[PDB]
Design a protein around this ligand. Structure first.
Ligand SMILES: Nc1nc2c(ncn2[C@@H]2O[C@H](COP(=O)(O)OP(=O)(O)O)[C@@H](O)[C@H]2O)c(=O)[nH]1
Ligand SMILES: Nc1nc2c(ncn2[C@@H]2O[C@H](COP(=O)(O)OP(=O)(O)O)[C@@H](O)[C@H]2O)c(=O)[nH]1
Ligand SMILES: [Mg+2]
Lengths: 301, 160, 81, 285, 90
């Protein structure tokens, strides 16, 4: 199963930085040494087994993207699953960006009429904090006026905080099929194991595939998933400095207990128990019961 | 899936004055569930009791694991070698007597499957006694708790 | 300890048998009356072929009524005087 | 007692307090030194037991060495119980051959002028620091170990705990500053110290996310919370585990997973070490 | 005058924590070892030559009457029924 994802945007908007940080295990300080992307850099990402993401890291320069809409129009915009257009919020040519975004939208509608548009308004860390909301809603009122042709969500991203993983989790959540089945599986696992919060990650990129939070969840932060993803990616890089693979995490807090163990061959599961009376050794094989069940299910199938 | 509240309700009815604590743990000392005679109301009165029960289970699992590699069954009952071939025995009860208490470690033979929810470590039932406790009543309580926990854990391998 | 076994053990003790001693083949299960100053280990270690015996210590004056069937021994404590 | 971070201009002191202190440490500026009477230097230097001088390795340091020597003479004439440490800084851009030659040149230039002055009784230590590495945390830990008068008792306790429990390496971190109060007699690997420093980051961040109910109650917690204990098993037959010792301390130990099969005995020895540490650090008569 | 009392306190609590530890390395299978002292066994015979106590279990047997035998065989059967009538739930 191949999904074709377009990564378009203006010159210097930061598309290769997002591709390197999310998929190629870069950090934010290492993207300053990234060179210019000449034409299109095709990337194949093995994400959740049989599903393969075709990432088309297109060049953002003007002579490249005049060539994209004229000669390579049939090669690029045909069979497009997700179109990602990246907007630099510190760009002084936003009216020049809107016309090019309209041209890319017109080519995408004329070639692949069943596609989803994501407008990532990048470089939000260069905007001061109290102005970081009403500026973004200023652009979000424009692009949603522009993008009435297809389904479009606009997200404010930056590589120096947790919003990048939220945006890329929202991007790859639509590409994963049968997500109500995984949501029902996580709901039944949290009901069976008496867990407050069950979050399923990916093994390599650590993007949040699915999550389920019960009413007994002690966490009140709405941006906790991408924060935990950043935590486990930083610790995976710390383990990879020692040439070792992180396998299991166990915690016993004052009122909680968090367990990060591998679930499938391509996932990690975070299980949080809100009851301190439940020991670690009960939950650490309560997860293994479901792991043995899905191994027995996937052995026959 | 194992419900520790079900195990606590199952072991709460087998607790008297002479038997303060009944706990279920693994051979590595990892505690699963435990009960007590009096329920503490203070937080620290729960914490020191939980630390004491965890230390008791941690020492008792290693004290069971020291004796599990010894087979004294050929050194009794002089008969033919087929009887010795029928003597593949595993430890199932262990009673330790002190001045100010008694300890009983019994391995719970879990049914269902040989690899259902344990990786070659049987669950151990730890029964703590006192000076006025009697060891024969502890064996009856141990076999009742074993035959109830085994039927309770016979429905393991819970799906999704 | 069950309530019906407790009242049965209270029915064991009377003004004649001043002490009741319930024991398995090797381990005690229930005590009533004055069971102290030895007179319990000799009941626990006791084993014989027959089923009905009367035993008293030759360095004491306590006479014990002992029955054994189905791997369960009942001991009754009363003074020889 | 306080810690004074001396040095010259563009030596790296403000970046040190940005990395370590900003995630009693005082930063005197690179100018208006002890010859100037802008501050009561003799009153401050009596109450200060640790003096740290930051020396840039890339820049010329002979004027910095003369300022260091007159500052050492000033603080020895103030009090004889001060500890002097030298922080060789900005070694991130230097090669592996350059660091050893710079350390040898700085130590040979300093320890002979110490004999030329005549104050050979005082001990002066030398440290290789860089703000982009974790060597600044290790150097500040070795500075802090001199000020604590309870270091050999904790070190002997960690030695007998590592020998008894088959623990390869143990540290007594402070979780707020990632500075270890005590360690055992075995040397500190940088690959071990990086994962031991980031273990606290993972624990504190997950406990900040999910420790919202009770935890930070303004009046009082109705139930006393458990100590924060964690276990991480790695793929290279090594297990890292933490146990919260005090309100600000923790004990991270590195143990092989062959020796972590008997984790209950290690847990009992951790509890006995917790009792020993809480009885040492309690107020007494 | 007060630091030495603190040092003595730390020495005695170090001795307490040293005595309270568990030697994990001694707690392993040190078996399949050759013998060390197979000669010092004559102390067993020269101490247990007699030592005034080789005495059998005493329980000096008198003969029971049929009334007490009938009483105890009636009591032991219903106590055995009480034993096998046990239950975990009340
Ligand atoms: N402050 C800030 N800088 C960014 C962000 N994203 C990217 N950058 C910087 O902007 C540059 C963008 O270069 P690049 O990713 O190659 O642009 P591209 O050719 O459109 O892919 C990088 O060197 C980054 O250092 C961001 O979110 N915030
Ligand atoms: N790249 C790099 N720069 C450093 C390092 N240490 C210090 N610096 C720089 O050197 C400057 C030193 O300033 P500093 O002496 O601390 O300012 P002061 O405390 O006010 O005197 C800082 O602004 C840092 O940017 C290092 O290890 N690497
Ligand atoms: Mg690019």
């Amino acid at each position: 199963m191949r999904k074709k994802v377009l990564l378009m945007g203006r010159s210097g908007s930061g598309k290769s930085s997002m591709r390197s940080i999310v998929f190629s295990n870069y950090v934010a300080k290492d993207t300053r040494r990234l060179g210019a992307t000449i034409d299109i850099e095709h990337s194949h990402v093995r994400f959740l087994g049989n599903l393969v993401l075709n990432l088309w890291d297109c060049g953002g320069q003007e002579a490249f993207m005049e060539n994209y809409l004229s000669a390579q129009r049939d090669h690029i915009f045909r069979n497009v699953q997700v179109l990602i257009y990246v907007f630099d919020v510190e760009s002084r040519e936003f009216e020049r960006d809107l016309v090019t975004f309209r041209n890319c939208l017109e080519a995408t509608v004329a070639n692949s009429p069943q596609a989803r548009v994501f407008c990532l308004i990048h470089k939000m860390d260069l905007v001061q904090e109290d102005l970081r909301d009403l500026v973004f809603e200023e652009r979000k009122a424009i692009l949603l006026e522009t993008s009435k042709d297809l389904e479009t969500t606009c997200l404010a991203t930056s590589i120096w905080d947790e919003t990048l993983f939220k945006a890329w989790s929202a991007i790859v959540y639509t590409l994963i099929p049968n997500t109500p089945t995984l949501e029902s599986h996580l709901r039944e696992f949290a009901k069976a194991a008496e867990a407050a919060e069950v979050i399923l990650f990916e093994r390599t990129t650590f993007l949040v595939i699915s999550s389920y939070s019960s009413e007994s969840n002690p966490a009140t932060d709405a941006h906790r998933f991408e924060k935990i993803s950043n935590i486990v990616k930083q610790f995976k890089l710390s383990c990879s400095k020692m040439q070792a693979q992180f396998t299991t995490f166990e915690l016993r807090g004052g009122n909680f207990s968090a367990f990060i163990v591998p679930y499938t061959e391509d996932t990690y599961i975070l299980v949080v128990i809100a009851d301190p009376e439940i020991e670690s050794a009960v939950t650490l094989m309560n997860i293994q019961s479901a792991r043995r069940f899905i191994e027995a299910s996937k052995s026959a199938s | 899936m194992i419900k520790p509240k079900k195990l606590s309700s199952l072991m709460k009815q087998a607790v008297e004055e002479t038997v303060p604590s009944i706990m279920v743990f693994t051979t590595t000392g990892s505690l699963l569930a435990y009960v007590s005679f009096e329920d503490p109301k203070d937080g620290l009165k729960r914490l020191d009791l939980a630390k004491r029960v965890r230390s008791i289970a941690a020492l008792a699992g290693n004290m069971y694991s020291l004796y599990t590699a010894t087979n004294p069954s050929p050194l009794v009952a002089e008969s033919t070698d087929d009887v010795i071939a029928h003597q593949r025995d595993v430890l199932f009860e262990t009673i330790i007597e002190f001045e100010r208490g008694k300890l009983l470690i019994a391995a719970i033979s879990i049914d269902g499957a040989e690899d259902k929810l344990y990786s070659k470590d049987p669950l151990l039932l730890g029964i703590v006694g006192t000076e006025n406790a009697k060891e024969g009543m502890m064996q009856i309580k141990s076999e009742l708790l074993k035959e109830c926990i085994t039927n309770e854990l016979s429905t393991l391998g819970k799906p999704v | 300890m069950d309530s019906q076994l407790s009242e049965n053990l209270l029915k064991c003790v009377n003004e004649t048998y001043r002490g009741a001693m319930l024991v398995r083949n090797g381990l005690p299960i229930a005590t009533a009356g004055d069971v102290n100053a030895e007179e319990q280990r000799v009941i626990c270690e006791w084993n014989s072929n027959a089923v009905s015996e009367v035993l008293h210590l030759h360095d004491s004056n306590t006479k014990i009524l002992i029955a054994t069937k189905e791997s369960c021994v009942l001991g009754l404590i009363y003074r020889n005087t | 007692r306080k810690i004074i971070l001396m040095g010259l201009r563009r030596s790296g002191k403000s970046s040190i307090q940005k990395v370590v202190f900003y995630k009693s440490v005082w930063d005197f500026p690179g100018q208006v030194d002890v010859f100037d009477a802008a501050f009561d230097f003799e009153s401050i230097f009596t109450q200060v037991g640790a003096l740290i001088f930051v020396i840039d390795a890339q820049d010329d340091y002979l004027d910095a060495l003369a300022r260091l020597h007159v500052t050492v003479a000033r603080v020895v004439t103030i009090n004889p119980n001060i500890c002097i440490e030298v922080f060789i800084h900005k070694v991130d851009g230097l090669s592996d051959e350059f660091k050893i030659d710079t350390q040898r040149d700085i130590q040979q230039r300093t320890q002979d002028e110490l004999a030329d002055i005549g104050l050979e009784n005082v001990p002066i230590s030398f440290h290789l620091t860089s703000i982009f590495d974790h060597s600044i945390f290790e150097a500040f830990s070795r500075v802090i170990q001199k000020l604590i008068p309870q270091l050999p008792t904790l070190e002997n306790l960690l030695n007998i705990f590592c020998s008894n429990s088959l623990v390869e390496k143990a540290y007594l971190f402070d979780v707020l500053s990632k500075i270890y109060v005590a360690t055992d007699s075995s040397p500190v690997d940088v690959q071990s110290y990086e994962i031991c420093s980031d273990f606290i980051d993972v624990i504190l961040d997950i406990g900040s996310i999910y420790g919202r109910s009770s935890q930070l109650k303004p009046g009082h917690s109705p139930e006393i919370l458990d100590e924060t204990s964690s276990v991480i098993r790695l793929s290279n037959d090594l297990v890292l585990f933490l146990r919260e010792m005090n309100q600000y301390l923790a004990l991270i130990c590195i143990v092989r997973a062959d020796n972590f099969e008997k984790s209950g005995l290690i847990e009992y020895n951790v509890q006995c070490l917790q009792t020993a540490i809480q009885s040492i650090f309690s107020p007494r008569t | 005058r007060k630091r030495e009392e603190e040092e003595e306190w730390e020495s005695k609590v170090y001795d307490v924590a040293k005595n309270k530890f568990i030697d994990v390395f001694s707690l392993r299978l040190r078996t399949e070892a050759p013998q060390r002292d197979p000669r010092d066994n004559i102390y067993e015979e020269v101490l247990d030559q007699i030592d005034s106590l080789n005495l059998d279990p005493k329980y000096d047997v008198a003969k029971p009457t049929e009334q007490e035998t009938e009483f105890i065989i009636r009591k032991l059967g219903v106590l055995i029924d009480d034993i096998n009538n046990i239950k975990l739930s009340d």
